């Protein structure tokens, strides 16, 4: 059963959570190929492991930039959580290490690109297509929340499509293990729950709100709350009002009204029946939850695969050389990395 699976999953998690993996590779063991993505602290690059021949995605964080942006604790959270988790829809962290200048997390390379890219290009996904991806997020959040983890950055930009057309959840930069409530203002403007915006303490229910934003965006092709500036987006989120496109089914509309719910005593995922309020909703009635987990369901979309290190499903980025200082920077702050 689910309870039996979750018990054994918590046991494997806590062993790695209590005794994390550290310094499991060297920079000189990889060949840098291309930048797959960027952020304020660095970039994600396609790398090749010299000894195995395998391709990986290596996230590089400049420690000085992490310190300047007050993200030391968030960065330690990311690496500690990632090395400890194991779920079919979470990207696997293969190695981690650090040097004088940077932090490195080497993960399995997902070549099918971001959901964001296919979503913007295509326009919108049909309801069975969006339901397929949403189901995977539901099982992923059920796994993470049972471990007391909050993801806090769900968006199409963070969801990668694998060779079998399944989702690989990426970027644990805002992920946190917290038993009670938390207060950090973080995430993406369009996906923030009203309680984050209103500087109230919040919990795991912000992830279920983010799920509502994701399902709406997948099915409509645009988020439920958009504007040109973040400030205008927050005004829209905190005021009730959500308009659904006329092509949305009654079941979709009903489930979204229960996910995009301001009232925490009424928001799905949070209540007494928990995740089963979502799993058992009528919009998910065709979903075989075990087959989705086992990856036995035929994906509505399989991306083009040219070669193991092909980057055609990703955008091009300005390349910048990796500079490793002769002097160790922020050693005390990133000691446990």
């Amino acid at each position: 059963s689910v309870k039996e699976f979750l018990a054994k999953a918590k046991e494997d998690f806590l062993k790695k959570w209590e005794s994390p993996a550290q310094n499991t590779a060297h920079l000189d063991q990889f060949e840098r190929i291309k930048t797959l993505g960027t952020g304020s602290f660095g970039r994600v690059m396609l790398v090749k492991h010299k000894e195995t021949g395998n391709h990986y995605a290596m996230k590089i964080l400049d420690k000085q930039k992490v310190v300047k942006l007050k993200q030391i604790e968030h960065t330690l959270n990311e690496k500690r959580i990632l090395q400890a988790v194991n779920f079919p829809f979470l990207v696997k962290l293969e190695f981690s290490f650090k040097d004088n200048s940077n932090l490195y997390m080497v993960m399995e390379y997902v070549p099918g690109g971001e959901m964001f890219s296919h979503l913007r290009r295509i326009g919108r996904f049909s309801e069975p297509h969006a339901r397929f991806y949403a189901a995977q997020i539901v099982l992923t959040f059920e796994y993470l929340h049972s471990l007391d983890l909050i993801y806090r950055d769900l968006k199409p930009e963070n969801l990668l499509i694998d060779q079998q057309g399944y989702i690989q959840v990426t970027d644990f930069g805002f992920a946190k293990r917290v038993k009670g409530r938390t207060w950090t203002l973080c995430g993406t403007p369009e996906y923030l729950a009203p309680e984050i915006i209103l500087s109230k303490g919040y919990n795991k229910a912000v992830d279920w709100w983010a799920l509502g934003v994701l399902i709406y965006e997948m099915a409509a092709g645009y988020p439920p709350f958009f504007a040109d500036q973040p400030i205008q987006i927050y005004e829209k989120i905190v005021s009730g009002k959500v308009r659904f496109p006329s092509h949305f089914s009654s079941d979709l509309k009903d489930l979204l009204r229960n996910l995009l719910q301001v009232d925490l005593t009424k928001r799905f995922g949070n209540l007494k029946n928990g995740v089963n309020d979502i799993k058992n909703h009528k919009w998910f009635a065709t979903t075989d939850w075990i087959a989705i987990y086992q990856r036995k369901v035929e994906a509505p979309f399989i991306p083009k695969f040219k070669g193991p290190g092909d980057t055609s499903n990703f955008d091009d980025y300005e390349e910048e050389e990796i500079r490793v200082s002769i002097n160790e920077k922020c050693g005390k702050e990133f000691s446990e990395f």
């Binding site: 326009g123 930009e157 403007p189 369009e190 958009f226 504007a227 308009r243």
Partner: peptide, 18 residues
């Protein structure tokens, strides 16, 4: 349309975190 309003907005590209 809402689509046209979205497509014409400055937030159709990759969205940054806060």
């Amino acid at each position: 349309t809402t689509y046209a309003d979205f497509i014409a907005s400055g937030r159709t590209g990759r969205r940054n975190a806060i």
